[PDB]
Amino acid sequence: AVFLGFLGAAGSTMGAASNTLTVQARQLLSGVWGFKQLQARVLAIERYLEVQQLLGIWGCSGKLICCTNVPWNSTWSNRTQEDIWNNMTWMEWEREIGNYTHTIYSLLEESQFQQEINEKDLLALD
Amino acid sequence: GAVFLGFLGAAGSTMGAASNTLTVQARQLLSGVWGFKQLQARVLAIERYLEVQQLLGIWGCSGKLICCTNVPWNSTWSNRTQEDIWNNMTWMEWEREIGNYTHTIYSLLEESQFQQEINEKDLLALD
Amino acid sequence: VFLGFLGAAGSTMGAASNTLTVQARQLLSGVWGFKQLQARVLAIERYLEVQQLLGIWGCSGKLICCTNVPWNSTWSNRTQEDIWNNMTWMEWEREIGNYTHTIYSLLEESQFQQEINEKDLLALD
Amino acid sequence: QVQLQESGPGLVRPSETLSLTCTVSGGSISDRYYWNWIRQRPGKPLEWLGNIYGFSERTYHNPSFKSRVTISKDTSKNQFFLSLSSVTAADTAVYYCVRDRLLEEYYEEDYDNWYRVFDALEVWGRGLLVTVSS
Amino acid sequence: NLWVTVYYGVPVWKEAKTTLFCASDAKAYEKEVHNVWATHACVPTDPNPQEMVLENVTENFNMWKNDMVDQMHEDVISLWDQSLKPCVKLTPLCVTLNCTNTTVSSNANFEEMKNCSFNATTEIKDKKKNEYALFYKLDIVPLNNSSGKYRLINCNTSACTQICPKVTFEPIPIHYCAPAGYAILKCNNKTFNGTGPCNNVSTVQCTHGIKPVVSTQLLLNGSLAEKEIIIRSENLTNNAKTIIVHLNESVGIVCTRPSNMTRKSIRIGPGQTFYALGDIIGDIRQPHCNISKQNWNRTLQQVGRKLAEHFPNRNITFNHSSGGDLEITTHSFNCRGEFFYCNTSGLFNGTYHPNGTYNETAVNSSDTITLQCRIKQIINMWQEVGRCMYAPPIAGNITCNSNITGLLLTRDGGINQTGEEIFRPGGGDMRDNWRSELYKYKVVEIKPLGIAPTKCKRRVVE
Amino acid sequence: NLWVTVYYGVPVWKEAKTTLFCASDAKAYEKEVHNVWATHACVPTDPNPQEMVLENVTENFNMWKNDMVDQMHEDVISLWDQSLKPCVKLTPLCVTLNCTNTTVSNGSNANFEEMKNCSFNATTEIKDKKKNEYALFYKLDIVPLNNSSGKYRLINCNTSACTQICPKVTFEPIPIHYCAPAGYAILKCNNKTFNGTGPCNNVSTVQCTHGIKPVVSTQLLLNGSLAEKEIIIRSENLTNNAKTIIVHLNESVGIVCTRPSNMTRKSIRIGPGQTFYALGDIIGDIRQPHCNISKQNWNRTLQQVGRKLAEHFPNRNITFNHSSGGDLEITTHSFNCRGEFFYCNTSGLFNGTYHPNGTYNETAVNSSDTITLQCRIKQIINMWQEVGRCMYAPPIAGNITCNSNITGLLLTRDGGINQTGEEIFRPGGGDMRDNWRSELYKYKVVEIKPLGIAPTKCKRRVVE
Amino acid sequence: NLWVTVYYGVPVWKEAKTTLFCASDAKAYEKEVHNVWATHACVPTDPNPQEMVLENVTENFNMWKNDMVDQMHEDVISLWDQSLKPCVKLTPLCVTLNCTNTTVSNGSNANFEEMKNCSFNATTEIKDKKKNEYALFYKLDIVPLNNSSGKYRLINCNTSACTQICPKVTFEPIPIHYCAPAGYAILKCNNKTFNGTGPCNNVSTVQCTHGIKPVVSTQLLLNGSLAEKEIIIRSENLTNNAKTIIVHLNESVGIVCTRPSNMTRKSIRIGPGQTFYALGDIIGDIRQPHCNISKQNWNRTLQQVGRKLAEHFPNRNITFNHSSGGDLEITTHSFNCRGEFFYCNTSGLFNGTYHPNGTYNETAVNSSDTITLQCRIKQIINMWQEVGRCMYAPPIAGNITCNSNITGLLLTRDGGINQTGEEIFRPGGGDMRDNWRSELYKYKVVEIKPLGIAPTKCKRRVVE
Amino acid sequence: QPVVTQSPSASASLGASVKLTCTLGSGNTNYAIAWHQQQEGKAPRFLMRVESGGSHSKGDGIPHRFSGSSSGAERYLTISNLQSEDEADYFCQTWTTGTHVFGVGTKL
Ligand SMILES: *[C@@H]1O[C@H](CO)[C@@H](O)[C@H](O)[C@H]1NC(C)=O
Ligand SMILES: *[C@@H]1O[C@H](CO)[C@@H](O)[C@H](O)[C@H]1NC(C)=O
């Protein structure tokens, strides 16, 4: 499309939201009032770089959808894929697994760092 | 070839010759009363580098300086042959002629790129 | 992974090779308002200056990446065994500080050379 | 320069009071600020009796003595007087009328009410032989 | 055998607080720094702003704890001080005044302005020259008991500066907009009060044009409701909190100050000057306000209808303010740079009975409520005596036309009283003037990171 | 079959306007906040800056609509206002002055009527006490209050309250660099015969500008840059007589002078914590401040500029006439000299006429002859051509001598419609940006666009 | 055959300087702008900060050339100037004062000559009218008012415009943490016997500093951080007499004292819209301030300090003496208590000598004895030893009291060249920055360079 | 009212130089003085004015042989080249703002 619809399809299910990832990242990053305007610009830079830093360390530097080697844990949820992508939206899913986000974020760093070290050994055999 | 030239070097050179000196410009990017102006100037250089890098990020050319795409060129944008493009004009004339159609072209690279990844995950979901 | 910022600084050369992710996490983390504003913008400049160098070298997200330039024996006469298990990162950057500019420039030329010939290879079909 | 000439009843046979006069030659009394009066009796040191101002009419009579001295301003014809009431036989003295020096320092009691600091006695001139006897 | 994947750019948000920058159309490139609101620095938004109505989503709202209302208040104090710093201070003006009976070239209504003569400083410091100026009765106190001299009211609390004539504080609409990575949510239910769930939430880049208007009892030239009269309150049972009433039908107000008074330039020192009232050409006529009887009766009729459900089987009566200080007792507004403090006694002069007939054919048409009031040109604003302002006069008569938007009501609620419920007006806080405008907005932060289990696995090279 | 490719770091630029920061040289790190221009915060540029000489490229320059000089103005008003906030104000000086003739000791009766001895009421440190004090004031700074009165008052009292230049700071024209931020470049032209508008065949890119010194003047440019090839006449519209004409000279004309009086600085206290410095007395005789211009060096410059004006105005008689008159600010050559503001009538400079045909050998004019210029001192200065804020100049406490060079002239034309034949050019400081537009005429800030797209035969590789 | 590889996130650092930001716990969300140090804007650090010990690392430290201390000193100038601008000034107060002996009611004839009952003319709420008033001022704040005077005036009338401290805001020493942005690290030494210069064998990194409180003092450092192992002597050059010596004790000595009197807080109005506060009256008996220090506590402390200097000064006799004298600002121990500025004559503290051989056991000294230190109150203060500052401390109703430790001493040495044998140590506040030097002696700011290069046996793969 | 004391008489030889003094005594000694001369009858004369720092203020017809100095609470007056007509009574007085106290003087 031609994007420009911010936070579109928020009420749609997660499966139907797989094609609705373009319109979010495009909008980001793009005297009493001057000081507040200057504070507005630097805040957006910090918000954009914080997300970008997490993408880089996870290996998903430019990939919108990327797969990882860590496995999901049944303690977090038991819901089947049919009831995940066709029954409930993105807003509720983040709320449900909100406590475990800190533990999950740590697991991403360890596995990706493991992919660098063993690949170096493989590339050192010739 | 001629990589150790100055900033904006070979600006008046041909299109093909300028392709070999694309590194000199990239290095120079991101290089009281005066304090506020310097702070504004220091801030202003940040999104200027960030706005351009956002476009390369969504096109898949996050780190590649020279990269191909899958969108097809349209003859209505430019008809002249490749021999006369790379060896008879500078970068000044090329952007000016297609300056009308810049906004249209920016749209197609997005649609192709998001198409290139949703079909990729289906390939990776077969095993 | 339980180690932290600047950990194993006094350790050996290769011991810190497996302790690189912890530092990168720490990066990018009214009289006081102006100084805090100046503090934040300076931290952004420090992070982007590093990220620009890794971007042009082709190691956009790689933590350890091999290159194609050859190491010069004039820069260092010590062997790999006497380098990787005898000293720390303090003294290493101290001794090669004279040749940092040359290595940065040579690596820039080689990376650009790696792309121009690659494009011609893709034009054969 | 200025000149001071004094005239009046120097010889007073009936002792009831005393009135004196000092004509001023040159600078007008109204201008040039302060003017003074000085007594001098034959045998005891000279004393100061009172003060008169030129512009604002602020009379600084001698605080040691009570209301026994009066000064006229007489700015119309360049003149100033002296009158002392109930003269005593011990008040036989020679009088000197004085003009003061110009040290322009003005203090302030109330809003738009200024006065100059006192100054050293400058000019002085002649005298009158007075013998108050009865 | 599910694995972990990361989706970037997901439509999930979390509430947060952040700063906002102004925005307004560059209608007037001229008038250098003339606008007090400083719309020159405000970026134009869009000739056609992008809108996206969201479906299948419900989000809670609470305007009472909204950070935007506080942030808007945090600005207007700073804009006023910025525009008043390069202006002359009226410290030397606080001298002895000699006022008397006003001479005109109506013997009970002309005692509002006094002809005063005060000592003034000419172009040189030492010399002083007699000058005369006209001051209202409200701005002078009689210094000492049984005296013929007066003094300004603000010479014993703080130094007073004046609003420079070069700047005009007319309410130009402005837009408050959030930075990138942040969005605001707009509700669309026409019967939605301050707190509750919204079933038609829509996102917007930033809010519509908002006119900063200072008022105490009546809201002017504001937005209009769609469906019906909406009454919003944090706690209905609590009588100590104010009640805001929004009107979907506007009633015309015409307030004028008929007099042609010369604007005299007066000097009070080297480079120090202000402007005062010169003289009166004609008859002394007090200012008045025009309110239609039928329009106001119809407005007061329907507001008691909806107020009956929040207080069932209770009689509803309208009464005037309690009294006290003039700042909150009367209805204060602005008209071409002139401040008005107007007694609203003729408006709140009724009682609503739920049972009866109230057809409009019985009320005679073309009837006007006249609101007798006066001009106060020295104003303490924000209900704290820390700052002072001096409004210069405008030559000739002035008039203003506006349409009333909302009502600011307070409930007494007698503990021993049953049946009749007494409602009185009150400007308990000035933030309520903007809470009625930002009742359909909320600042929220965007989190574009999302994870979910799936069957895909990252390929590894061998 | 052609496909689109994306190129990064391409040399493509687009015109844009931006802000610039200061830059200077580490000449001296001493002194305490003495510099008004505040070069302490100005970052040093480079001991040997990087310049690249571009070629194959032609760029259009239009400096008459340039944001460089307009932004450079916005700094000067900010620097001057910033350095005068912690300074005393001359409000108590608005008092009655008992002025008369000056007195000279034993040791000219038509030359001493310039400075008037004046006495006034002066409040001391305790406020509520006044003592008489005296100072020497210039004729131009006093208005005689009332008709047929011997009492004067300050001219600037009734206009606006205005402050004093603090002696702790100095405002000598140190050269300063304004340097573009990252991603923005400044284009420098190199054609010697390039006037205000036109294409440039030797456009060269630089990181940022060279040394530009802020000098304030109205009629003659002082200590400026010199041209390379010849004299260039520049105007926005030569046919329009209301627009000033800037002339750049490649030959430097040296002007050297001084004010010949040794005057002691006297400190006078006017209130609690407020003190100002005024003229104390005069030692020796009273002599008017004069300035020298060499005769041989002057018309040799004026004949060359006379010839160049003949090309733009063919077969017209060229003459130079003195200023029309009016206010003192623009009628006289106003400049600065160790903090003292001078005002010299240039009636002895623009007097002659130019004939295209004839002889103009130098040996006809005798050497070692200098033109004297009468200069008057005024320490109550209002500038920016508006009645705003003062800049009170303190005494020098000695005898200042300053040596300068004339760089260019700011000429205006009468443009008589009915008049035919002779062309009259008169100097005029209509606007003061032209004092600085002669230094930024070859400069233009541009924005870099590092994105480029073009079709090619290469194709993206898609996994299967 | 070896190739160059790139490592990211390497632990290597390089010394540099940078700007920091404040940080403190949000203990009190109330008290709007009541804190001068502006702790509200400071971000809370951490309930449990990250302190981590590095191993096998040696780093040199030198706080005599540290930018950490210099930034702190520049801040305190800005923090004070920010909170004093929205306050009334004492310019209208500078009028003639009629001061007379203080009258005491029925209920010491050589000790009451400290306060004077001064009367003056003050402007009421209307400028034209004036009404007499009375106030109490200390003898140190008045001068004989030059010639022809039987009356007094304020001390700083003829120096600068003198301001007042607002009573709505308080400047108690709330500890603050100075913290570095991302990519900047602060190192912390941990050797217990580390003097001013030398490598540290127990360097440990930290996010930023611990609680540091700004305390203004001249001779004795109050309520500071105690040493760990023993008393350490810090000096840039021991042999140089002109440089101060900082003594850091590991044991604290309790100093407590009061200003025993009830002062009525009288509100007086000067000018339109300005009110300042002064001492109202006396209720009871006038008694001078006095500060007590335990005999055994102070005598024991000086013995270890004397013998610690014995190693640095072998074969020399060490004695302690009072201040040289002169100006009251540095010859006395000036400290803070509730907002009233004190000036304690420290002469009986340095009332002894130390010998290398002898007996100094605690049983000889009689306990429960103390040294009384005479002090004088000065409510008009010029700070930072510059001619343009005032901080008028308003009186506080009722008597005040304080409780603080003794942590550091500032010592100076005579060092007579001809003098041999005995040497004399005297207290003196040579530099104001020395007070913060005792809390920033183990801290250093450093950059992080996450780029590292080294040869390796791996080669970058090229696709074919 | 500052009170000044002085020696009742002074002894000196003819043709020498006299050193006349008068002592100042008060709570505040900062008040300045001004010397005078009293001849036999007719009218006494005003000579010069003293201030802090030895500010000589010889007004009317005073030669340069009448120098003076101050030393604490007592001020020194130096007279050179004495003549037969130089013998008279010299008075030192204070000003304040009223109550001119004058001086006892010394007769030679
Ligand atoms: C008020 O007076 C002004 C000034 O003379 C005049 O122009 C104007 O017409 C008058 N207004 C009326 C209503 O007469
Ligand atoms: C001028 O005045 C100064 C200052 O008093 C003095 O030193 C100097 O000798 C005088 N004469 C000359 C010729 O400079």
Tab-separated table of C-alpha atoms in Angstrom, chain F residues 230-374:
chain	number	residue	atom	x	y	z
F	230	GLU	CA	41.164	43.378	-10.721
F	231	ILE	CA	38.302	45.525	-9.435
F	232	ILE	CA	34.792	44.048	-9.622
F	233	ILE	CA	31.633	46.179	-9.514
F	234	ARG	CA	28.716	44.295	-7.958
F	235	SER	CA	25.039	45.250	-7.765
F	236	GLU	CA	21.687	43.499	-7.552
F	237	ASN	CA	20.169	45.856	-10.147
F	238	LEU	CA	22.549	48.377	-11.709
F	239	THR	CA	19.667	50.142	-13.473
F	240	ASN	CA	17.972	50.668	-10.081
F	241	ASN	CA	19.337	53.703	-8.230
F	242	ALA	CA	17.867	52.740	-4.831
F	243	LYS	CA	20.185	49.729	-4.358
F	244	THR	CA	23.724	50.178	-3.057
F	245	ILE	CA	26.738	49.361	-5.233
F	246	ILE	CA	29.644	47.457	-3.668
F	247	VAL	CA	33.131	47.924	-5.133
F	248	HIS	CA	35.987	45.566	-4.243
F	249	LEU	CA	39.530	46.890	-4.685
F	250	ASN	CA	42.557	44.676	-5.308
F	251	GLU	CA	44.933	47.461	-4.197
F	252	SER	CA	45.015	48.311	-0.494
F	253	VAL	CA	44.671	51.983	0.457
F	254	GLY	CA	46.285	52.634	3.828
F	255	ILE	CA	44.626	54.973	6.318
F	256	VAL	CA	46.503	55.785	9.532
F	257	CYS	CA	45.477	58.252	12.241
F	258	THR	CA	44.821	58.827	15.938
F	259	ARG	CA	43.131	61.185	18.356
F	260	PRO	CA	45.881	63.469	19.739
F	261	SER	CA	44.952	64.036	23.375
F	262	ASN	CA	46.213	62.484	26.614
F	263	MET	CA	43.157	62.399	28.885
F	264	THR	CA	43.015	60.797	32.324
F	265	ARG	CA	40.183	58.382	33.064
F	266	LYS	CA	38.168	59.464	36.111
F	267	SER	CA	35.956	57.067	38.068
F	268	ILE	CA	32.641	58.612	39.145
F	269	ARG	CA	30.227	56.844	41.498
F	270	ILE	CA	26.517	57.439	40.873
F	271	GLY	CA	24.932	54.904	43.227
F	272	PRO	CA	25.339	51.796	45.375
F	273	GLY	CA	27.611	49.483	43.404
F	274	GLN	CA	27.274	51.500	40.179
F	275	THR	CA	30.222	53.406	38.729
F	276	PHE	CA	30.988	54.853	35.301
F	277	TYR	CA	34.132	56.287	33.727
F	278	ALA	CA	34.173	59.687	32.014
F	279	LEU	CA	36.732	62.222	30.824
F	280	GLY	CA	38.639	63.774	33.711
F	281	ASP	CA	40.551	66.712	32.239
F	282	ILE	CA	42.744	67.809	29.328
F	283	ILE	CA	46.542	67.886	29.579
F	284	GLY	CA	48.110	70.306	27.121
F	285	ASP	CA	46.284	71.993	24.255
F	286	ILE	CA	43.017	71.049	22.545
F	287	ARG	CA	43.382	69.666	19.022
F	288	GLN	CA	40.745	68.049	16.802
F	289	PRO	CA	41.066	64.376	15.765
F	290	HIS	CA	42.359	64.207	12.192
F	291	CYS	CA	42.966	61.419	9.674
F	292	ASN	CA	45.348	61.154	6.725
F	293	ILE	CA	44.791	59.813	3.204
F	294	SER	CA	47.603	59.864	0.647
F	295	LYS	CA	46.837	61.927	-2.450
F	296	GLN	CA	48.818	59.816	-4.928
F	297	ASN	CA	47.398	56.525	-3.648
F	298	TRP	CA	43.806	57.798	-3.699
F	299	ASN	CA	42.918	58.917	-7.230
F	300	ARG	CA	45.072	56.122	-8.642
F	301	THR	CA	42.481	53.923	-6.947
F	302	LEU	CA	39.694	56.307	-7.984
F	303	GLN	CA	40.832	56.423	-11.621
F	304	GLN	CA	40.846	52.621	-11.870
F	305	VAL	CA	37.342	52.379	-10.404
F	306	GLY	CA	36.395	55.250	-12.708
F	307	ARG	CA	37.394	53.218	-15.760
F	308	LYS	CA	35.512	50.115	-14.594
F	309	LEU	CA	32.271	52.069	-14.110
F	310	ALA	CA	32.451	53.154	-17.768
F	311	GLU	CA	31.800	49.622	-19.055
F	312	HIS	CA	28.512	49.236	-17.169
F	313	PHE	CA	27.539	52.844	-18.049
F	314	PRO	CA	28.834	53.444	-21.591
F	315	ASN	CA	29.853	56.925	-22.815
F	316	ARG	CA	28.642	58.644	-19.628
F	317	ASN	CA	30.670	61.164	-17.643
F	318	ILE	CA	31.576	59.695	-14.246
F	319	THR	CA	31.922	61.927	-11.189
F	320	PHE	CA	32.015	61.303	-7.443
F	321	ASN	CA	30.113	63.650	-5.136
F	322	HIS	CA	29.918	64.026	-1.371
F	323	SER	CA	27.038	62.654	0.680
F	324	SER	CA	23.634	64.323	0.465
F	325	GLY	CA	23.488	65.029	4.201
F	326	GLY	CA	20.932	64.576	6.943
F	327	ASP	CA	21.717	62.545	10.047
F	328	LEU	CA	25.296	62.069	11.223
F	329	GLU	CA	25.170	58.256	11.303
F	330	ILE	CA	25.231	57.657	7.529
F	331	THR	CA	26.622	60.971	6.242
F	332	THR	CA	30.088	60.394	7.734
F	333	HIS	CA	32.499	57.457	7.658
F	334	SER	CA	31.757	55.903	11.052
F	335	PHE	CA	34.248	53.293	12.242
F	336	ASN	CA	35.810	52.039	15.473
F	337	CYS	CA	39.361	52.471	16.739
F	338	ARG	CA	40.345	50.790	20.039
F	339	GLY	CA	36.791	51.120	21.334
F	340	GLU	CA	36.323	54.777	20.347
F	341	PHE	CA	33.637	55.595	17.784
F	342	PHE	CA	34.822	58.032	15.114
F	343	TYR	CA	32.809	60.172	12.690
F	344	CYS	CA	34.767	61.715	9.806
F	345	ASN	CA	33.227	63.653	6.934
F	346	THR	CA	34.475	62.363	3.579
F	347	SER	CA	34.211	65.599	1.619
F	348	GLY	CA	37.893	65.616	0.688
F	349	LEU	CA	37.766	62.090	-0.757
F	350	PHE	CA	34.813	61.987	-3.186
F	351	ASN	CA	35.394	65.307	-4.929
F	352	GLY	CA	36.882	64.631	-8.350
F	353	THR	CA	35.453	63.479	-11.664
F	354	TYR	CA	36.527	60.863	-14.202
F	355	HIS	CA	36.995	61.516	-17.916
F	356	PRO	CA	37.295	58.376	-20.086
F	357	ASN	CA	39.560	60.205	-22.568
F	358	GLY	CA	42.695	61.990	-21.409
F	359	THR	CA	45.881	61.365	-19.452
F	360	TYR	CA	46.182	60.141	-15.860
F	361	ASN	CA	49.900	59.704	-15.211
F	362	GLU	CA	50.964	59.613	-11.567
F	363	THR	CA	53.906	62.023	-11.942
F	364	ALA	CA	51.516	64.964	-12.426
F	365	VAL	CA	50.462	64.737	-8.758
F	366	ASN	CA	53.078	65.669	-6.167
F	367	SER	CA	54.037	63.004	-3.638
F	368	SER	CA	54.184	63.163	0.182
F	369	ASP	CA	50.845	65.016	0.273
F	370	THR	CA	48.101	63.678	2.541
F	371	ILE	CA	44.413	64.579	2.704
F	372	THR	CA	43.328	65.635	6.190
F	373	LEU	CA	39.923	64.501	7.460
F	374	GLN	CA	38.121	66.139	10.377
